[PDB]
Write a protein that holds these residues in place. Structure first.
Motif, short mmCIF file in Angstrom:
data_model
loop_
_atom_site.label_atom_id
_atom_site.label_comp_id
_atom_site.label_asym_id
_atom_site.label_seq_id
_atom_site.Cartn_x
_atom_site.Cartn_y
_atom_site.Cartn_z
N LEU A 296 80.30 0.13 0.08
CA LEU A 296 81.09 0.81 -1.01
C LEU A 296 80.31 2.00 -1.56
CD1 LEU A 296 79.51 -0.22 -3.55
CD2 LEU A 296 81.31 -2.00 -3.77
N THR A 297 79.23 2.42 -0.89
CA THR A 297 78.48 3.56 -1.43
C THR A 297 79.28 4.85 -1.41
OG1 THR A 297 77.19 4.13 0.53
CG2 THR A 297 76.28 2.42 -0.98
N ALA A 298 80.06 5.05 -0.34
CA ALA A 298 80.76 6.31 -0.19
C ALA A 298 81.94 6.38 -1.15
CB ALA A 298 81.31 6.43 1.22
N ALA A 299 82.46 5.22 -1.56
CA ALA A 299 83.68 5.28 -2.39
C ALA A 299 83.27 5.82 -3.77
CB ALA A 299 84.27 3.88 -2.55
N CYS A 300 84.21 6.49 -4.43
CA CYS A 300 83.87 6.97 -5.78
C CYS A 300 84.81 6.37 -6.82
CB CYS A 300 84.06 8.49 -5.85
SG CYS A 300 82.84 9.38 -4.87
N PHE A 301 84.27 6.16 -8.04
CA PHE A 301 85.09 5.64 -9.14
C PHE A 301 85.95 6.79 -9.71
CE2 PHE A 301 86.17 4.58 -13.46
CZ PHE A 301 86.49 3.25 -13.38
N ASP A 302 87.26 6.64 -9.67
CA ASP A 302 88.15 7.67 -10.20
C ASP A 302 89.56 7.05 -10.21
OD1 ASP A 302 89.23 10.28 -10.87
OD2 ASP A 302 87.61 11.19 -9.67
N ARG A 303 90.57 7.87 -10.50
CA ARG A 303 91.96 7.41 -10.48
C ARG A 303 92.55 7.86 -9.17
NH1 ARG A 303 95.29 4.33 -13.37
NH2 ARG A 303 94.02 4.83 -15.21
N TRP A 304 92.95 6.90 -8.38
CA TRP A 304 93.51 7.12 -7.04
C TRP A 304 94.97 6.72 -6.98
CZ3 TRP A 304 90.13 10.01 -4.95
CH2 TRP A 304 88.78 9.84 -5.27
N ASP A 305 95.71 7.37 -6.08
CA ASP A 305 97.13 7.10 -5.97
C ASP A 305 97.55 7.39 -4.53
OD1 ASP A 305 100.04 7.71 -5.98
OD2 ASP A 305 99.92 7.14 -8.07
N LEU A 306 97.90 6.33 -3.81
CA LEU A 306 98.15 6.44 -2.38
C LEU A 306 99.47 5.77 -2.05
CD1 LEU A 306 94.75 5.54 -0.68
CD2 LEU A 306 95.72 7.87 -1.02
N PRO A 307 100.11 6.17 -0.96
CA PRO A 307 101.27 5.39 -0.54
C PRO A 307 100.81 3.99 -0.16
CG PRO A 307 100.59 6.94 1.15
CD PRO A 307 99.80 7.29 -0.05
N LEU A 308 101.64 2.99 -0.37
CA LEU A 308 101.33 1.59 0.02
C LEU A 308 100.73 1.50 1.41
CD1 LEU A 308 101.29 -1.48 -0.60
CD2 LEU A 308 103.64 -1.59 0.27
N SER A 309 101.29 2.19 2.39
CA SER A 309 100.76 1.97 3.77
C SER A 309 99.28 2.34 3.90
CB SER A 309 101.60 2.73 4.78
OG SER A 309 101.50 4.10 4.51
N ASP A 310 98.81 3.30 3.12
CA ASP A 310 97.37 3.66 3.10
C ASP A 310 96.46 2.55 2.64
OD1 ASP A 310 97.96 6.10 4.30
OD2 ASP A 310 97.31 7.28 2.50
N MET A 311 97.01 1.50 2.03
CA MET A 311 96.30 0.38 1.49
C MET A 311 96.10 -0.72 2.55
SD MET A 311 95.70 1.89 -1.33
CE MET A 311 94.89 0.60 -2.32
N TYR A 312 96.53 -0.42 3.77
CA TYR A 312 96.36 -1.35 4.92
C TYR A 312 95.60 -0.56 5.97
CZ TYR A 312 97.78 -2.97 9.57
OH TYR A 312 97.84 -3.25 10.93
N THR A 313 94.52 -1.17 6.52
CA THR A 313 93.75 -0.54 7.59
C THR A 313 94.13 -1.20 8.90
OG1 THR A 313 91.92 -0.10 6.09
CG2 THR A 313 91.44 -0.06 8.48
N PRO A 314 94.68 -0.42 9.86
CA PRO A 314 95.30 -1.00 11.04
C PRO A 314 94.23 -1.28 12.13
CG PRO A 314 95.64 1.36 11.09
CD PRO A 314 94.88 1.04 9.80
N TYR A 315 93.25 -2.09 11.77
CA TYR A 315 92.29 -2.60 12.83
C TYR A 315 93.06 -3.22 13.99
CZ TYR A 315 88.64 -2.00 9.32
OH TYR A 315 87.72 -1.42 8.43
N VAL A 316 92.67 -2.87 15.22
CA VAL A 316 93.45 -3.35 16.38
C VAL A 316 93.46 -4.87 16.40
CG1 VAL A 316 93.74 -3.29 18.92
CG2 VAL A 316 93.25 -1.21 17.66
N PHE A 317 92.32 -5.52 16.13
CA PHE A 317 92.32 -6.93 15.99
C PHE A 317 92.44 -7.14 14.48
CE2 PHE A 317 90.08 -10.83 14.80
CZ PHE A 317 90.77 -11.73 15.59
N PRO A 318 93.58 -7.71 14.04
CA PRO A 318 93.84 -7.81 12.57
C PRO A 318 92.90 -8.76 11.84
CG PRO A 318 95.91 -7.85 13.79
CD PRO A 318 94.77 -8.13 14.83
N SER A 319 92.58 -8.41 10.60
CA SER A 319 91.73 -9.28 9.77
C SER A 319 91.96 -8.88 8.30
CB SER A 319 90.19 -9.09 10.03
OG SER A 319 89.81 -7.72 9.76
N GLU A 320 91.25 -9.57 7.41
CA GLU A 320 91.13 -9.05 6.02
C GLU A 320 90.79 -7.57 6.13
OE1 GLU A 320 91.13 -9.79 2.56
OE2 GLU A 320 90.17 -7.81 2.18
N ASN A 321 91.47 -6.77 5.31
CA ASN A 321 91.33 -5.31 5.37
C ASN A 321 91.85 -4.69 4.06
OD1 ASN A 321 94.14 -3.85 5.72
ND2 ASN A 321 94.20 -5.86 6.69
#
Ligand SMILES: [K+]
Ligand SMILES: [K+]
Ligand SMILES: [K+]
Ligand SMILES: [K+]
Lengths: 409, 204
Positions: A296-321
């Motif tokens: 989480l070092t690269a992430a920054c604290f701020d106000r973010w607003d994304l479409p729902l689909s951006d909140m899912y990471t499409p790893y080819v082998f699915p897992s917690e994401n």
């Protein structure tokens, strides 16, 4: 998402802050910083207060001191954050004009809120039946099932808000690093996923210990306690209070005990399937991309607003994401949650992610799965064939506390 | 300690007292403490404490409660790390067990007086008629923190009336890699911003 972690850790400018002074040190060995300016921004809980820019003029291996201007004092309570970014104003052979090559953030002053919430005009009403504790306030209803001890339904006007009750969750759909080389026909009993499966974490059933209701001067208080057990072993105990007040806010306090001889659990949080699908996810916390406690070092604290689909990471082998950490407020549809939590939000249940071998076989479920964690284990990765989550990112404390407020947005 | 809130509610089998305090200095709020005290029909008082510490104040030496008890008792009995004094960055030698010492052994007579005698990892403490249960660090002695701070030499200390109890949810490391520059390592500094702890106080 891991790429942004690599970019950040591999930055060629390092930064220190002392008072008003940013010290920029170049890790270039040969070039001067002849295509760089520093943008700085100060924001109060994501609300911009001031910003500016200064050219960088730093020799290889050199330092530059940048003295920030005195900032006006913020007009309210909260945490001031400084973010700096190195921007390359000119295109190069390998980048476009405006390319951001480096960033860093710091907490500046915090003024803790000491102002009391205004006394409300309404007080909520409890109905007690054999099956349920129901709380009504204006256009809202909350239903606690007395046989399960969970919040089974909430209504805003005539609209049910839940497809699945709000329940504790101590497992994650296992990452490739949790699985390692383990397979159904050649179990590796050392892998995290196999330790969790062997201890019954995925199979454990909630036993209700206590489900009581009280009325306070300005609120209804629901108190619950559950034990998770597997083959006679108590793995986890969750004790909670829900306090619903005249303002419509439901404050949820959670205190979890984790048996010291069970493998440390993947997470300590709640989940639910919300009835609604909304277009946007808005949060104040670390982002914008997926981030986990040991990434989480690269992430920054701020106000973010994304479409729902951006909140899912499409790893080819699915897992917690798609977790985002260090979140103090989350907004989705009519709902707002506040606290200090980690969350993910998507159309796929943990169960489906765990069971499905390939991302193209996932199907969107009805509504929206919310996982809100007080605590989440690290993901590891020093290799992917032996446990690699370092001890400081394992959930080994034994007793855990978190608190959430759920209200309307 | 500015008082923000103090309320009382009468419940089914208990009285619940809720408090909130802000510590401030010259206009700056350093710490907020929010508590509930739930006193039930069995006579137990459950105390829950949630503290916020401003991110820009130096990390505090401890987050705890204290009081001066009227009781002066001969023994101190606890289930926790011991038997000797132990702090978060100096507790490897202490063992978890049931310990029972004279009161005087819970004070360490450092020639230059300071905070002393903490025992960490304690789940149960008994002193006279009192019992406290939870997961806390504590010290207990006839000397106030104020008196230890103000007094230059151990021989100048005087036993105060009663017994001073400090019960901490959290306590900063002591350091020592040297004694002329800050030496407590980051992981032993109380930097988390939000702290929770819970105690039960009962008789017998
Ligand atoms: K970060
Ligand atoms: K899978
Ligand atoms: K020890
Ligand atoms: K002294």
């Amino acid at each position: 998402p891991a790429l942004t972690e690599a970019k950040h850790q591999q930055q060629f400018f390092q930064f220190r802050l002392s008072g008003q002074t940013i010290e920029v040190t170049s890790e270039y060995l040969f070039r001067h910083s002849d295509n760089e300016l520093l943008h700085w921004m100060v924001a109060l809980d994501g609300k911009p207060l001031a910003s500016g820019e200064v050219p960088l003029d730093v020799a290889p291996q050199g330092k530059q001191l940048i003295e920030l201007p005195e900032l006006p004092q913020p007009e309210s309570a909260g945490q001031l954050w400084l973010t700096v970014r190195v921007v390359q104003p000119n295109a190069t052979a390998w980048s476009e004009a405006g390319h951001i090559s480096a960033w860093q953030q710091w907490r500046l002053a915090e003024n803790l809120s000491v102002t009391l919430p205004a006394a409300s005009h309404a007080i909520p009403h409890l109905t007690t039946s054999e099956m349920d504790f129901c709380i009504e306030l204006g256009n809202k209803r909350w239903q606690f099932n007395r046989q399960s001890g969970f919040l089974s339904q909430m209504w805003i006007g005539d609209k049910k808000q839940l497809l699945t009750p709000l329940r504790d969750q101590f497992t994650r759909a296992p990452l490739d690093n949790d699985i390692g080389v383990s397979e159904a026909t050649r179990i590796d009993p050392n892998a995290w996923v196999e330790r969790w499966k062997a201890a019954g974490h995925y199979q454990a059933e909630a036993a209700l210990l206590q489900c009581t209701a009280d009325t306070l001067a300005d609120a209804v208080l629901i108190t619950t306690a559950h034990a998770w057990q597997h083959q006679g072993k108590t793995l986890f105990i969750s004790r909670k209070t829900y306090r619903i007040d005249g303002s419509g806010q439901m404050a949820i306090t959670v205190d979890v005990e984790v048996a010291s001889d069970t493998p440390h659990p993947a997470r300590i949080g709640l989940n639910c399937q919300l009835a609604q699908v909304a277009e946007r996810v808005n949060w104040l916390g670390l982002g914008p991309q997926e981030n986990y406690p040991d990434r989480l070092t690269a992430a920054c604290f701020d106000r973010w607003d994304l479409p729902l689909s951006d909140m899912y990471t499409p790893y080819v082998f699915p897992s917690e994401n798609g977790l985002r950490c260090g979140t103090r407020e989350l907004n989705y549809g009519p709902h707002q949650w506040r606290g200090d939590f980690q969350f993910n939000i998507s159309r796929y249940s943990q169960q489906q992610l765990m069971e499905t071998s390939h991302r193209h076989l996932l199907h969107a479920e009805e509504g929206t799965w919310l996982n809100i964690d007080g605590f989440h284990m690290g993901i590891g990765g020093d290799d992917s064939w032996s446990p690699s989550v370092s001890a400081e990112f394992q959930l080994s404390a034994g007793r855990y506390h978190y608190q959430l407020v759920w209200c309307q947005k």
